[PDB]
Amino acid sequence: TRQKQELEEELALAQAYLEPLERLAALAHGLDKSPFLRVIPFLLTEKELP
Amino acid sequence: GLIKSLAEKEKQLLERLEAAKKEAEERVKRAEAEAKALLE
Question: Does residue B9 contact residue A33 with C-beta atoms inside 8 Å?
Fold first, then answer.
């Protein structure tokens, strides 16, 4: 019963988070070999952007 | 997205800083040699 819940929980987070993380990772790439530059990820849609 | 570029610049610089330090401490190992020798 526990296992079932856990699996579901993993998926729920994993699907949701998958898209920002690949996208952010692609943008971030070259700094995530070892931050020596420091980076801040964040999602914003159109409004916050300016 | 430049990104890749400047995140290379931090590598080159680090290995130049690194290189300075190394030859620096070599000079110390050099003064150690004379320090025995000059007494011997």
Answer: no
**Residue B7 touches partner A, C-beta closer than 8 Å:** yes
> What residues of chain B lie within 8 A of the CB of A28, using their CB?
3
Single-letter residue type at A36: F
- Reading phi first (left if > 0) and then psi (alpha if -120 to 50, else beta), residue B3 is in left
Helix ranges restricted to H, A1-50: 2-28
Resolution (A): 5.0
Question: How many angstroms away from the CA of B39 is the closest CA of chain A?
Answer: 46
